[PDB]
Symmetry: D5
């Protein structure tokens, strides 16, 4: 077995190929995945795994220089909106309209689907660099 790094085989493969500025998506259960974009579905049942738990894990295993989210998350979902803000306190957090956000997901390397059943609980983690 692999000694270090993220436990998920599909996810490790994705992180393995990450280059500076590449993007991945952590999505709630309703986010549509653009055609051509790999979908790694971790959902077990409504609410599991949670948007937060998943974001925490990716944050611990990926060097993130920027986080992007839909402004709508601030309106209907303040919980996750503040979680994301605190988790990535030092990174760059930008809000776009959900529409623009979805457009940007076309460039993602993969969309990680969680069981999160709350509005606009989605974000784009943009890869930083180790040197």
């Amino acid at each position: 077995m692999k000694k270090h790094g993220i436990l998920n085989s599909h996810l490790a493969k994705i992180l393995a190929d990450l280059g500076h500025t590449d993007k991945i998506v952590i999505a709630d259960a309703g986010l549509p995945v653009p055609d051509g974009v790999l979908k790694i579905d971790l959902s077990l049942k409504p609410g599991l795994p949670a948007f937060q738990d998943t974001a925490a894990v990716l944050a611990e295993e990926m060097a993130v220089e920027k986080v992007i989210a839909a402004a709508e998350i601030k309106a209907s979902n303040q919980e996750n909106a503040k979680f994301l803000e605190n988790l990535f306190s030092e990174q760059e957090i930008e809000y776009l309209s959900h529409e623009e956000f979805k457009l940007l997901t076309k460039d993602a390397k993969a969309v990680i689907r969680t069981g999160e059943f709350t509005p606009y609980a989605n974000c784009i983690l943009q890869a930083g660099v180790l040197f």
Copy 2:
């Protein structure tokens, strides 16, 4: 979005094709997956999702007529061994040596990998029939 059934897209696809007697595997994080057998990895981190939580979900979404496990689970892991026994109280529960168990996984339609970090926490759910 799909109104009913299991929440996981990969899993729904697998269940969708299940015929009477087809088999699927729910595995701990260390079970080797035979070549050719689809691997759907739900692991988030050590212990998550748990062997039990996953088995409960599959039991609620799949008609199971038989469960197979490695006898070794009774020795080092009584917790999950009793969970499986209670969960599938009415189904047929057979124990094989872990070796024989792994041989049988060659015929599985897929191996669902969980984050379970406990010995021999693996089982084969054999599809029943609705009529």
Copy 3:
């Protein structure tokens, strides 16, 4: 076997992947399917299965937030046109010219071909969200 959800394996796989706003088509025996769009043909013989029957099943298995049809259905196929309005009484129903409808079918995740042998018996079901 799969306990809940739509019975058709091909269809279940399609619903499994539906994200908010994704679209699928239910078509009559003569609708052309754009290149690259998955075609799942349910037809048994002329008239079977019927547009109506298929539309009913999909409505029970998918959360539809909007329905789209060719305006030519109202004039050339009153029976099926009113059926739609009735079945999707709560959903937003939009009519486009048949030509524009077909253009839109290029974005569909799949086209479900029925045995319907009546003019313009086609519709696009746009996925809603469970939360």
Copy 4:
């Protein structure tokens, strides 16, 4: 559109390649499909389309020289057994144990899944010759 022949596009393609002795299967909603065998699922909901209805269409579009079924069809399905005897009057009708039957489906060009929710409602059509 295609003028003559079976209406289903997937089935049409299967019949097109049939040579003397090639076999197809018509199955109830629970028959397991062997790996590598194309599955054309016509099912719409439990019971539809029916084993009998589907079997009739295929008899009308395919030159059958022999029909094979599981003996268990007589004990667990007396009706469907008579139907076959009647439908394929001039054809040889062989019965095997369900197990032998399933082993035989491995050679089939495809398995047509019906919505039949009746025990052992399966059969193999063995193509004859037109000259």
Copy 5:
């Protein structure tokens, strides 16, 4: 064997998927086939099978609502030009410059190559509807 419809397996599969307005091409031994368009070559030797014979069989197995040919066919190959006009008496027969005709063949679902060795003996058959 297949009881009804066109005898050629490759052609059968093509006709089977035809939706209203889809197009196929019947070509002479010299027509270039656009990249990506399935080529079904029926030629045996110079002149066989003939453009006319092939065109007759397709007329008998496919519902044609429109026929397209290059105007140059009226200049050098009046025989085949007259044949085509009489074969599709009721249908719409449109002539385009050979150059424009070739551009249109890019939308075709397939190009059937015959053994015809006479100038511009090519045509596009656009599919109609059975209802």
Copy 6:
């Protein structure tokens, strides 16, 4: 255009790869094609093209050192049987039971389906060498 050799593009590709002792099959409209063997269908309609005509073309474009056919042809299809003897009068002609013949078609590089509608009108051409 290609100046020399067989006209059929599909057939030219098959001959081009022919090595000493590679086998090819010319079949009637009913011979089953073993799985994995390329099927090049030249059939236009019942009887066209004819086994004889197809055989003549191949004989003139392929160096044949041996021909194999089913014994059943001598009595059930005396015409095409005489033909074979005459056409390949200088080659070694071997007859096997139709069953053995079919098993032997497993090793064929391709099966060329003709429109021939007479029983046992099949044969195998075994490639020779030009030096």
Copy 7:
């Protein structure tokens, strides 16, 4: 073995599909092959086989109506330039800048790499018709 036509199997396949106006490329050991264009490398060692020898074979096995080359060849490779004029004395010979020539190779069905080691020893053969 194949009795007639070009000896190279890879080349025979390319010619077999040639339609009126399809293009082919004979290149020296340095010409870049555009992505997506099939590369058939005949090179054995520097200078072998020669552009001239390769051109002669293709000219005798392919009906050519036009030849295109880079103007740079007339001055940087007078020998092979004269050759071309002589070999294709009856065909239309057009010269383009080497850059335009390369852009034009994007549409080629294949690039045949020779061992030629002299600058601008490349050309495009445009297929003609046998009728």
Copy 8:
């Protein structure tokens, strides 16, 4: 970028999938790789990278429970043979004839080719388990 784990993307993907008892190979510049076994070549030039260096990295990133090598390493490559015994002091080390070793490499998930230019510098690392 990926924060933890092995730096090589190809290797990380391989470790990602390791299940208890799965095997991978570290090979010298001359070991033959069985068909079907993924080859990840790290070689830069003769000697680089070295067997030892690669073995060290893999040992730090993979949980090895057993190591396998050719007995010919002891006699023909003392330096690398003792290196192994030292690095994997706690693991079970088994030696087989080189021929038997190679046979075993057929079961490997991949062969990591190094630039090692010394005799029999090859080994199989069998994955252990983290629990």
Copy 9:
């Protein structure tokens, strides 16, 4: 074994297809690889193999006519910038903004990932000609 040329099997294959002007990339451990561009990752651990070492090998096995790098390499990597100037004395060395540079890598035949953990340590080698 291969007698001459670069030792890496993956690189050898890339160099083999190089035509005049084709480009390859040598990248540090953080350069993102565009979709569709083959990635040959040689990295072993941070720093190994080095950008310079890798660049030297490629210069010894590939005829480079031009080298392209990001201007940012001079400010964030004064050493590696001199190395390139020295190594490719007779070659044109063009500098672009890192952004333009990345856009250029989209046309590369492949990206060779080194273990270089130094800012902007990337370059594009543009193949020259041997005649």
Copy 10:
């Protein structure tokens, strides 16, 4: 361009993967190529390129530890049999019946087809080691 090694791109890729004991074949225009074995056809026309010339280039670019040929080559083609013996003076030259030789070609990594038109001018070159 590639600076060193064999000129042929297809051949380069093959040599690049050669591991000790791997085998490739150099064949005359008549040797059949076993199914699944990559065929690299270098033939231009009868006799070119010659078996000898091709064999010389491969001897110069590949480390051969053994040569295999059919004994029939000594009977009909002594010229090429002597050439082979002198070319590989030091190496082991084993003769097998042509039939056995052909069986061995199934293990080959590739078959290089030359234009040689003389009997049994084929051989297997088994790879050696550079250390």
